[PDB]
Amino acid sequence: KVFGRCELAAALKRHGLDNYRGYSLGNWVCAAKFESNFNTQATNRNTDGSTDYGILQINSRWWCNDGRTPGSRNLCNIPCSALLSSDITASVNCAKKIVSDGNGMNAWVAWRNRCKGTDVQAWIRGCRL
């Protein structure tokens, strides 16, 4: 499923992401935009052989099991395919663990390079939340 900007903002908010660990909603919507372009089915393979899954591009080396990443840790205890569902619950639950890992949202390279220090508020402007 390809989410709309305000649609995603609302789903993320309902799932407890607005201000989770100090990160306003705009940060999460901006990160989703650049990581997957709001597409739940996005996947991208990395050079180390791992793969990123879903709307938030969660990595198979540490967070989910895809059955093809030797040494994967599967910290979210879920098969990576669960992250590609139209229901964003698993992606959100796993992201909560990732952002709490100590490095905050810096764990997402697109957030760090394209959202961090920007007016992220623009991402939820005009939405009924």
Side-chain angles (χ1 to χ4, degrees):
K1 176 189 181 175
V2 178
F3 274 86
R5 185 176 58 87
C6 297
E7 182 183 23
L8 182 66
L12 296 178
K13 190 189 179 185
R14 169 174 62 105
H15 285 81
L17 285 196
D18 183 15
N19 284 112
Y20 185 89
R21 291 304 105 93
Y23 295 92
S24 66
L25 206 55
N27 285 282
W28 297 103
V29 174
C30 182
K33 173 68 187 175
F34 298 122
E35 284 296 348
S36 66
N37 198 27
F38 301 147
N39 187 3
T40 65
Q41 295 193 82
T43 56
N44 286 288
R45 194 141 198 202
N46 301 305
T47 51
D48 63 1
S50 62
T51 305
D52 302 321
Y53 296 84
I55 199 166
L56 287 177
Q57 290 291 276
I58 292 174
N59 193 257
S60 67
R61 177 166 308 288
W62 315 93
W63 311 103
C64 61
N65 171 59
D66 63 2
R68 71 165 192 193
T69 309
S72 169
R73 278 193 73 199
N74 194 12
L75 299 175
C76 289
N77 204 231
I78 43 173
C80 299
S81 53
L83 302 180
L84 308 182
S85 175
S86 54
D87 183 322
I88 67 166
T89 300
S91 280
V92 175
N93 295 153
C94 190
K96 283 179 173 166
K97 295 208 181 66
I98 300 176
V99 75
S100 301
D101 198 62
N103 193 231
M105 283 196 72
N106 293 300
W108 285 273
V109 67
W111 176 78
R112 204 180 62 255
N113 293 326
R114 317 176 66 173
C115 300
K116 189 171 182 176
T118 71
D119 184 55
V120 295
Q121 301 88 282
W123 290 103
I124 57 166
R125 182 187 298 138
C127 307
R128 189 157 197 58
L129 299 171

